[PDB]
Amino acid sequence: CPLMVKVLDAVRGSPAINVAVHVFRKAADDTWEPFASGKTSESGELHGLTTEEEFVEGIYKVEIDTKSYWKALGISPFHEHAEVVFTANRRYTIAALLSPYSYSTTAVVT
Amino acid sequence: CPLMVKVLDAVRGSPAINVAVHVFRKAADDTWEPFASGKTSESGELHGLTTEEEFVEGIYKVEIDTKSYWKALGISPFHEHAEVVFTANDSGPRRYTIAALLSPYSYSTTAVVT
Amino acid sequence: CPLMVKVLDAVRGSPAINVAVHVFRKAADDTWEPFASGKTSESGELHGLTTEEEFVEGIYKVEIDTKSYWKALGISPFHEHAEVVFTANDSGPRRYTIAALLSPYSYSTTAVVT
Amino acid sequence: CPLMVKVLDAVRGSPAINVAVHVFRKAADDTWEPFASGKTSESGELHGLTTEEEFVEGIYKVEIDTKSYWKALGISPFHEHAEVVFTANRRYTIAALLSPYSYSTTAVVT
Ligand SMILES: Oc1c(Cl)cc(-c2ccc(Cl)c(Cl)c2)cc1Cl
Ligand SMILES: Oc1c(Cl)cc(-c2ccc(Cl)c(Cl)c2)cc1Cl
């Protein structure tokens, strides 16, 4: 499992559950092609997005649908979504900590 | 000054100087059109990107070139850039301050709206 | 103005107004003695805590009363307060900006030193 | 395991390993008494600090020796340490994300 996403809610102190995540890889024409997607689990995590075979060097985008998450809680958020763009050159954990008007993201590469 | 960007360096405890910032607005055909650009000053701030008149309702993307910043300090960072995407002026003109706190493998962004 | 505190609210995207701040300095007997205190203004800032003359070398603690802030908004937060502990003026007088970004279960603090 | 600490390094994108952590409980005379301590493991985590029986309601302080961590990497840090003070009223994860001049802490309560 080379790529894992974890999403946390800073308002409620809890995993961010059922948050949609879309992963894209940059194609040779500088366009983003769909690569993987899912919804975070009860633990705020999304595993099994890809395999070592498929996860070749390249530029990836992870898009987290933070707007839909805050709207379900009745809170008006600022951002349309959160995006994390990085080059893969090798276990990657992308973590995001969400508030309505702020987010932080961190990469743990182990 | 309806749109301001402030960028700080969490490694050196200093403003992040000479950071390139590009702003885009989503077009009628869902394309990102260039809107404004600049570089942060010695105080880590970028003012003067736009005017009230030009800054109409829409979805904007503020792209901060964090990679070039870290590379020039001899650090190879994780992210290609930091992107902030938001709807602006939805219910009338607001002033927006977009702040970013930068580390090589992490960044935080906050908005202050008034 | 060698010591400044800026506090932002990540829930409302606004400065955090009327937040109590207490500063202490470590005494000769390793006790925290009161040094200065105040409340953040409408811009979330607290200036005028001290002067260059009074702000001598030492270990300082800036305690931000985040709990009272969240309670007054009807939120029961996790932390009792946010504490920032640092050595100041170790190699001559510096100016220190201590920034805090607040959420009910999380806070971040950054220092800008010049 | 009601109390867990996780510490991450934002400069290197890695767990913060061998970081000393001291936990204190507020005594009736408003003094801090030692409660538990240890060093984070390879995964930046510290488990087995206390038991359900011992972890009664009260005010706790978690102190993370961030200064010693940065000094071992040859980087001059700002803070003397990072402190997290909270009331326990029930699995608590305290996470800290460390930079030389900045830290963030978050509580996940599940
Ligand atoms: O995480 C932070 C922190 Cl702790 C502080 C700021 C910030 C914003 C505005 C100003 Cl004028 C300053 Cl001094 C700091 C931004 C972010 Cl994103
Ligand atoms: O700012 C933070 C903080 Cl304080 C903690 C995390 C984080 C990352 C991984 C795990 Cl397993 C946990 Cl519990 C927290 C992420 C971010 Cl982005």
Side-chain angles (χ1 to χ4, degrees), chain A residues 1-90 92-110, chain B, chain C, chain D residues 1-90 92-110:
Chain A
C1 198
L3 177 68
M4 194 258 289
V5 172
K6 189 175 182 69
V7 190
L8 294 184
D9 176 334
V11 177
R12 293 146 83 248
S14 66
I17 299 161
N18 294 325
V19 185
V21 176
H22 286 82
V23 182
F24 303 91
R25 182 173 190 284
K26 205 165 228 220
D29 64 343
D30 287 290
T31 252
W32 293 111
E33 64 181 30
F35 178 77
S37 60
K39 279 200 162 259
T40 59
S41 71
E42 296 272 85
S43 75
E45 300 176 349
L46 184 59
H47 290 94
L49 285 169
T50 190
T51 52
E52 284 203 38
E53 215 87 296
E54 294 165 12
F55 196 54
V56 300
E57 293 189 294
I59 295 172
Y60 294 82
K61 179 171 74 170
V62 174
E63 179 188 84
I64 299 164
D65 181 7
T66 61
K67 195 180 182 185
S68 290
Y69 181 79
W70 296 115
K71 294 212 314 283
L73 300 176
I75 296 160
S76 50
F78 176 77
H79 303 94
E80 289 295 306
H81 50 245
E83 276 194 29
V84 175
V85 185
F86 67 97
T87 298
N89 284 142
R90 185 108 181 217
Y92 296 82
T93 292
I94 304 297
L97 171 67
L98 301 190
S99 294
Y101 284 76
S102 184
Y103 64 84
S104 190
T105 185
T106 326
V108 189
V109 179
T110 290
Chain B
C1 219
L3 178 58
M4 204 260 279
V5 178
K6 180 153 182 59
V7 190
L8 300 182
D9 176 327
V11 172
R12 298 197 294 154
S14 77
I17 299 162
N18 276 322
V19 178
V21 173
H22 289 72
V23 188
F24 302 89
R25 178 181 183 273
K26 215 179 230 182
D29 67 325
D30 294 302
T31 289
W32 291 112
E33 58 185 38
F35 178 76
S37 63
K39 272 164 163 289
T40 59
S41 65
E42 284 179 353
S43 62
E45 307 191 343
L46 177 49
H47 298 90
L49 283 165
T50 193
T51 60
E52 307 204 16
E53 202 75 52
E54 180 185 59
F55 194 40
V56 294
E57 295 185 82
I59 297 166
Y60 291 79
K61 169 165 63 161
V62 171
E63 167 187 291
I64 305 171
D65 184 18
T66 56
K67 185 167 189 169
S68 295
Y69 182 80
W70 292 117
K71 288 221 317 280
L73 302 182
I75 292 159
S76 63
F78 182 73
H79 305 95
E80 287 299 295
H81 52 243
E83 277 191 27
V84 180
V85 183
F86 63 103
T87 304
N89 308 305
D90 218 9
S91 38
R94 293 288 188 109
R95 305 195 190 138
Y96 297 87
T97 295
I98 300 278
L101 176 63
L102 304 188
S103 296
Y105 279 72
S106 177
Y107 62 83
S108 201
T109 183
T110 326
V112 177
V113 178
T114 62
Chain C
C1 219
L3 178 58
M4 204 260 279
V5 178
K6 180 153 182 59
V7 190
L8 300 182
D9 176 327
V11 172
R12 298 197 294 154
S14 77
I17 299 162
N18 276 322
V19 178
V21 173
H22 289 72
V23 188
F24 302 89
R25 178 181 183 273
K26 215 179 230 182
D29 67 325
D30 294 302
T31 289
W32 291 112
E33 58 185 38
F35 178 76
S37 63
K39 272 164 163 289
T40 59
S41 65
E42 284 179 353
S43 62
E45 307 191 343
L46 177 49
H47 298 90
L49 283 165
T50 193
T51 60
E52 307 204 16
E53 202 75 52
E54 180 185 59
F55 194 40
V56 294
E57 295 185 82
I59 297 166
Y60 291 79
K61 169 165 63 161
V62 171
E63 167 187 291
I64 305 171
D65 184 18
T66 56
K67 185 167 189 169
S68 295
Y69 182 80
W70 292 117
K71 288 221 317 280
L73 302 182
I75 292 159
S76 63
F78 182 73
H79 305 95
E80 287 299 295
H81 52 243
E83 277 191 27
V84 180
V85 183
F86 63 103
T87 304
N89 308 305
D90 218 9
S91 38
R94 293 288 188 109
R95 305 195 190 138
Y96 297 87
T97 295
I98 300 278
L101 176 63
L102 304 188
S103 296
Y105 279 72
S106 177
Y107 62 83
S108 201
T109 183
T110 326
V112 177
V113 178
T114 62
Chain D
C1 198
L3 177 68
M4 194 258 289
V5 172
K6 189 175 182 69
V7 190
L8 294 184
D9 176 334
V11 177
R12 293 146 83 248
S14 66
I17 299 161
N18 294 325
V19 185
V21 176
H22 286 82
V23 182
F24 303 91
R25 182 173 190 284
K26 205 165 228 220
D29 64 343
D30 287 290
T31 252
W32 293 111
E33 64 181 30
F35 178 77
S37 60
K39 279 200 162 259
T40 59
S41 71
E42 296 272 85
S43 75
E45 300 176 349
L46 184 59
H47 290 94
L49 285 169
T50 190
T51 52
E52 284 203 38
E53 215 87 296
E54 294 165 12
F55 196 54
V56 300
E57 293 189 294
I59 295 172
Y60 294 82
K61 179 171 74 170
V62 174
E63 179 188 84
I64 299 164
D65 181 7
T66 61
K67 195 180 182 185
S68 290
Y69 181 79
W70 296 115
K71 294 212 314 283
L73 300 176
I75 296 160
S76 50
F78 176 77
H79 303 94
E80 289 295 306
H81 50 245
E83 276 194 29
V84 175
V85 185
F86 67 97
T87 298
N89 284 142
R90 185 108 181 217
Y92 296 82
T93 292
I94 304 297
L97 171 67
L98 301 190
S99 294
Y101 284 76
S102 184
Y103 64 84
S104 190
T105 185
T106 326
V108 189
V109 179
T110 290

mmCIF file of all heavy atoms in Angstrom, chain B residues 10-13 101 103-106, chain D residues 10-13 97 99-102:
data_model
loop_
_atom_site.group_PDB
_atom_site.id
_atom_site.type_symbol
_atom_site.label_atom_id
_atom_site.label_comp_id
_atom_site.label_asym_id
_atom_site.label_seq_id
_atom_site.Cartn_x
_atom_site.Cartn_y
_atom_site.Cartn_z
ATOM 1 N N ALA B 10 8.238 28.543 8.293
ATOM 2 C CA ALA B 10 8.231 27.915 9.610
ATOM 3 C C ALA B 10 9.591 27.327 10.026
ATOM 4 O O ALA B 10 9.764 26.939 11.181
ATOM 5 C CB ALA B 10 7.132 26.822 9.715
ATOM 6 N N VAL B 11 10.502 27.226 9.068
ATOM 7 C CA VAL B 11 11.845 26.699 9.309
ATOM 8 C C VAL B 11 12.757 27.796 9.870
ATOM 9 O O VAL B 11 13.505 27.545 10.829
ATOM 10 C CB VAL B 11 12.429 26.086 8.028
ATOM 11 C CG1 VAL B 11 13.907 25.705 8.180
ATOM 12 C CG2 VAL B 11 11.627 24.851 7.653
ATOM 13 N N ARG B 12 12.659 28.993 9.293
ATOM 14 C CA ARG B 12 13.562 30.094 9.628
ATOM 15 C C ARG B 12 12.942 31.135 10.542
ATOM 16 O O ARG B 12 13.643 32.029 11.030
ATOM 17 C CB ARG B 12 14.017 30.745 8.335
ATOM 18 C CG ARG B 12 14.791 29.741 7.469
ATOM 19 C CD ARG B 12 15.571 30.458 6.418
ATOM 20 N NE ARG B 12 14.670 31.093 5.488
ATOM 21 C CZ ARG B 12 14.973 32.162 4.760
ATOM 22 N NH1 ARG B 12 16.184 32.710 4.844
ATOM 23 N NH2 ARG B 12 14.065 32.666 3.923
ATOM 24 N N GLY B 13 11.634 31.018 10.759
ATOM 25 C CA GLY B 13 10.854 31.990 11.545
ATOM 26 C C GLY B 13 10.935 33.388 10.950
ATOM 27 O O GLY B 13 11.257 34.372 11.637
ATOM 28 N N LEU B 101 1.502 29.171 5.834
ATOM 29 C CA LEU B 101 2.668 28.883 6.687
ATOM 30 C C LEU B 101 3.395 27.685 6.071
ATOM 31 O O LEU B 101 2.789 26.615 5.929
ATOM 32 C CB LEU B 101 2.177 28.555 8.103
ATOM 33 C CG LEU B 101 3.298 28.147 9.072
ATOM 34 C CD1 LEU B 101 4.284 29.333 9.247
ATOM 35 C CD2 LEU B 101 2.699 27.688 10.387
ATOM 36 N N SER B 103 6.374 24.735 5.471
ATOM 37 C CA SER B 103 7.503 23.891 5.895
ATOM 38 C C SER B 103 7.779 22.972 4.713
ATOM 39 O O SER B 103 6.943 22.850 3.832
ATOM 40 C CB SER B 103 7.138 23.051 7.139
ATOM 41 O OG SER B 103 6.879 23.858 8.273
ATOM 42 N N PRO B 104 8.968 22.356 4.662
ATOM 43 C CA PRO B 104 9.269 21.501 3.478
ATOM 44 C C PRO B 104 8.256 20.370 3.174
ATOM 45 O O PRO B 104 7.951 20.122 2.017
ATOM 46 C CB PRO B 104 10.664 20.938 3.812
ATOM 47 C CG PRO B 104 11.304 22.077 4.675
ATOM 48 C CD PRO B 104 10.127 22.490 5.570
ATOM 49 N N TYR B 105 7.751 19.703 4.203
ATOM 50 C CA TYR B 105 6.785 18.619 3.993
ATOM 51 C C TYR B 105 5.375 18.949 4.485
ATOM 52 O O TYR B 105 4.539 18.047 4.657
ATOM 53 C CB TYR B 105 7.322 17.333 4.645
ATOM 54 C CG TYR B 105 8.343 16.635 3.753
ATOM 55 C CD1 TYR B 105 9.628 17.174 3.565
ATOM 56 C CD2 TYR B 105 8.009 15.439 3.084
ATOM 57 C CE1 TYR B 105 10.573 16.535 2.716
ATOM 58 C CE2 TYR B 105 8.956 14.790 2.233
ATOM 59 C CZ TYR B 105 10.216 15.360 2.068
ATOM 60 O OH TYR B 105 11.127 14.728 1.278
ATOM 61 N N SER B 106 5.095 20.213 4.761
ATOM 62 C CA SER B 106 3.784 20.547 5.294
ATOM 63 C C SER B 106 3.452 21.994 4.979
ATOM 64 O O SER B 106 4.334 22.828 4.911
ATOM 65 C CB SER B 106 3.787 20.323 6.797
ATOM 66 O OG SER B 106 2.562 20.699 7.393
ATOM 67 N N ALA D 10 7.876 18.048 10.313
ATOM 68 C CA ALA D 10 7.440 18.714 9.089
ATOM 69 C C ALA D 10 8.569 19.110 8.147
ATOM 70 O O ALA D 10 8.296 19.547 7.025
ATOM 71 C CB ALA D 10 6.629 19.970 9.430
ATOM 72 N N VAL D 11 9.823 19.042 8.617
ATOM 73 C CA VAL D 11 10.989 19.416 7.806
ATOM 74 C C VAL D 11 11.432 18.235 6.960
ATOM 75 O O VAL D 11 11.748 18.381 5.786
ATOM 76 C CB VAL D 11 12.193 19.886 8.693
ATOM 77 C CG1 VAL D 11 13.431 20.206 7.845
ATOM 78 C CG2 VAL D 11 11.828 21.142 9.490
ATOM 79 N N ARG D 12 11.434 17.057 7.571
ATOM 80 C CA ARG D 12 11.948 15.871 6.895
ATOM 81 C C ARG D 12 10.842 14.938 6.390
ATOM 82 O O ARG D 12 11.135 13.987 5.648
ATOM 83 C CB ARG D 12 12.913 15.162 7.834
ATOM 84 C CG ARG D 12 14.154 16.013 8.061
ATOM 85 C CD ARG D 12 14.675 15.837 9.441
ATOM 86 N NE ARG D 12 15.520 14.661 9.569
ATOM 87 C CZ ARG D 12 15.200 13.577 10.266
ATOM 88 N NH1 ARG D 12 14.032 13.501 10.893
ATOM 89 N NH2 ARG D 12 16.056 12.557 10.321
ATOM 90 N N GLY D 13 9.595 15.188 6.797
ATOM 91 C CA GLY D 13 8.463 14.351 6.363
ATOM 92 C C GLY D 13 8.516 12.939 6.966
ATOM 93 O O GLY D 13 8.286 11.932 6.288
ATOM 94 N N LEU D 97 2.852 18.317 15.295
ATOM 95 C CA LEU D 97 3.570 18.424 14.052
ATOM 96 C C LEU D 97 4.615 19.492 14.254
ATOM 97 O O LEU D 97 4.276 20.633 14.540
ATOM 98 C CB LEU D 97 2.586 18.841 12.957
ATOM 99 C CG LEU D 97 3.175 19.232 11.588
ATOM 100 C CD1 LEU D 97 3.821 18.012 10.876
ATOM 101 C CD2 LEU D 97 2.048 19.853 10.702
ATOM 102 N N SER D 99 7.918 21.966 13.483
ATOM 103 C CA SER D 99 8.901 22.700 12.654
ATOM 104 C C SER D 99 9.828 23.499 13.610
ATOM 105 O O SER D 99 9.505 23.621 14.792
ATOM 106 C CB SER D 99 8.181 23.647 11.698
ATOM 107 O OG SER D 99 7.419 22.906 10.756
ATOM 108 N N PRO D 100 11.001 23.992 13.138
ATOM 109 C CA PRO D 100 11.868 24.733 14.094
ATOM 110 C C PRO D 100 11.228 25.968 14.762
ATOM 111 O O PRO D 100 11.471 26.210 15.954
ATOM 112 C CB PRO D 100 13.083 25.142 13.224
ATOM 113 C CG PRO D 100 13.156 24.024 12.213
ATOM 114 C CD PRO D 100 11.694 23.767 11.868
ATOM 115 N N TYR D 101 10.413 26.710 14.025
ATOM 116 C CA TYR D 101 9.745 27.902 14.574
ATOM 117 C C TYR D 101 8.234 27.837 14.652
ATOM 118 O O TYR D 101 7.575 28.889 14.796
ATOM 119 C CB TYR D 101 10.114 29.131 13.766
ATOM 120 C CG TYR D 101 11.502 29.619 14.088
ATOM 121 C CD1 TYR D 101 12.611 28.948 13.598
ATOM 122 C CD2 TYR D 101 11.698 30.765 14.847
ATOM 123 C CE1 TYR D 101 13.907 29.388 13.903
ATOM 124 C CE2 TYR D 101 12.983 31.223 15.145
ATOM 125 C CZ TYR D 101 14.076 30.512 14.683
ATOM 126 O OH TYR D 101 15.364 30.965 14.923
ATOM 127 N N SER D 102 7.677 26.633 14.549
ATOM 128 C CA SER D 102 6.240 26.484 14.558
ATOM 129 C C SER D 102 5.887 25.066 15.036
ATOM 130 O O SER D 102 6.602 24.112 14.752
ATOM 131 C CB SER D 102 5.694 26.733 13.129
ATOM 132 O OG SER D 102 4.273 26.684 13.136
#
